[PDB]
Subunit: 152 residues, 6 copies
């Protein structure tokens, strides 16, 4: 299992697609422990047409979504390694989200870095927590519990 993955790999693991695949690259990955990934934020994203006009702010809820996707990748690969065939049969679902705090607004030009760590894991149930960072500063923090379920 490698520690760096690019968009082509992320595409083979996550079921998410435009306009909901919110992770561009993974820089650090340690099975059952943590992951560090990021998503570039550009004005050239449909979301900014409505959030907000003349005032582009990346939706906080999407920051959270990005962290979860990161956690989901971590969870899956921790269990099956880089296995596209199986990834294609599994799907990660949000069970809970807690202690979410937005400290700094994210805007075009920003590199939204996700820092998630495994707080608890047993089988398909994974609890992760971490922060979203921009230039080393915590722009947000959150905790979530995910479920690795069947796609059917």
């Amino acid at each position: 299992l490698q520690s760096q993955f690019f968009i082509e790999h992320i595409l083979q693991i996550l079921p998410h697609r435009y306009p909901m695949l919110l992770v561009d690259r993974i820089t650090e990955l340690q099975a059952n422990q943590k992951i560090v990934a990021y998503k570039n934020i550009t004005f050239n994203e449909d979301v900014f047409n409505g959030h907000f006009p003349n005032k582009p702010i990346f939706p906080g809820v999407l920051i959270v979504e990005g962290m979860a996707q990161s956690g989901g990748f971590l969870a899956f690969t921790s269990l099956w390694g880089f296995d596209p065939e199986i990834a294609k049969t599994k799907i990660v679902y949000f069970m809970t989200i807690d202690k979410v705090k937005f400290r700094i607004p994210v805007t075009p030009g920003d590199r939204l870095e996700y820092h998630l760590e495994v707080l608890k894991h047993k089988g398909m149930i994974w609890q992760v927590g971490g922060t979203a960072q921009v230039d080393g500063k915590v722009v947000a923090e959150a905790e979530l519990k995910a479920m690795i379920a069947e796609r059917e």
Copy 2:
């Protein structure tokens, strides 16, 4: 205390594709609000969440609850005032106790039920659930702060 999309457009700064509230069916100042957003396949989000399996994003359910709550907080203090609405912004500070129980899909009428847990000055804490056909599909607590635009 019915508001339709046109009224909503004059209060919330959110526009497509991030205005997630279609109508407000109930509103009690400083107490509660009930609103909803219809879920149809004809939404761009479904192209990627997920292909061959449309599921309205859980985070977007929370966003819709937030928008409803912000609408509740705003109108409670200033009522239906478009002019003042442009000079104020309601952004969220925290979100907690979020739980997803049932997946929302095209055909569902996503109803938001938020009540004021407490408020002090420009800091308001709302909480409640998201419902479809009378069942709780999600629940969450959010804290917002009303500030001057600019």
Copy 3:
């Protein structure tokens, strides 16, 4: 009932031209009742019209045609995704359509279509579109199922 997943297996239409979200009633060679939710979160509203969201009358008719199309597919071969994935549908005629009430975000656009006449791949249906029990539009149309 047939949900979006089932509708996707029969109708060839896709985003942003799949305008039926669910099938509530189906009676082979007789009628069909289905609907589509109308939400502000639809790209059409950016241009119809700015500052005044009104669901296009022609799209209401399209939604009725699709509903009729689903009735035609199933009446012809039942719920068969395999043969369905090879056909498409062409509009042939549209007649006697009247719009009485504008459809907007928050509305539940319900399609009520019955078979007027049909032969082979050519189906002619007619009915109304309703929002909360009231008729918002009436129409008759004939479409043809074809091998793509």
Copy 4:
């Protein structure tokens, strides 16, 4: 009143906008009588993503919409002439549609020419009828009645 109008002029008269402004140019226009205009059809249009996958067919209902918009432009300029200030607060409602027949499918690379004639008009209520053509051939026939109304 001119007889040739370009997209810029159309934008100043019709309230429609992307993705529902289906008229690119007006080639000839006779007040209270007829109008000839057209819309280019290209693969680079969002509708084609779903109508249909691997087989781009310009939706029949949108052809009708295009003719209605052509009629709408004719209706407005016949009423107030070319006046953008009056135009910016008017919208247009479809009232009825009749005797439409589609003969030939329209596809990317086609120049959809609208030919509408005024059958009857009274105040804001205009009833036009005509055809849509491609390379001199009739691909559609349609009769419609639309109402111009002040936004309120």
Copy 5:
């Protein structure tokens, strides 16, 4: 053949919405020249931002269309209309030169691409020509691409 419609173009070029900028091919002569075109309608997303109240088809996209026309010519020159083989190839465009824009392109225009092979050595194809609207040269450019095995 000499005339390919959108159906055929789709089976040869990997490009898809919103980057497939060639609607039909009216002329094709293996190893020599290609004449094709793309209609320009207001109903295109690019016009939402280029520019508000002033729809001007982007000059770089005219070049892209020409490039796509060159790529179809090159490919068809090597294997003809072969969808199966098309799936295993890619045409990397290495350079662009001598491009000049003479007349803006707008909704309602039939952008016609006129390209010819200027040189072909190995996997390298140098193409050049013009973009026309109603008989008038609207733009011109030279492009060089490399044929390679897709991956």
Copy 6:
């Protein structure tokens, strides 16, 4: 005239809007001499739906467009400084493009950096040339001449 401009400033100067505003932030600016800016590349961009499926690659022509917009931002501010009022009355026209080379493909997660210098400028006509860089490496080269014109 400062040297760092964020998206809010770019929005008030350049007439480009979604989905054609391909410059997110200005990092260095020397009036009439040079500019360094960038655009973040994310998978969450509509253009990637078609360029190409299962293989996101930021279009070479769009990189040139990005360099042109950076040039346009330099040209305008050199001429009128930060003046939103006057910026509203202009648009930018591409006149020529030359010597462009595409050395390295640009993909999601990349920070596309634009480096442009003024080769010549006379009135509204500006000739700029430079490179596009990702992590200090030259990804593309180009020379172009644009013109700032009245919206009329």
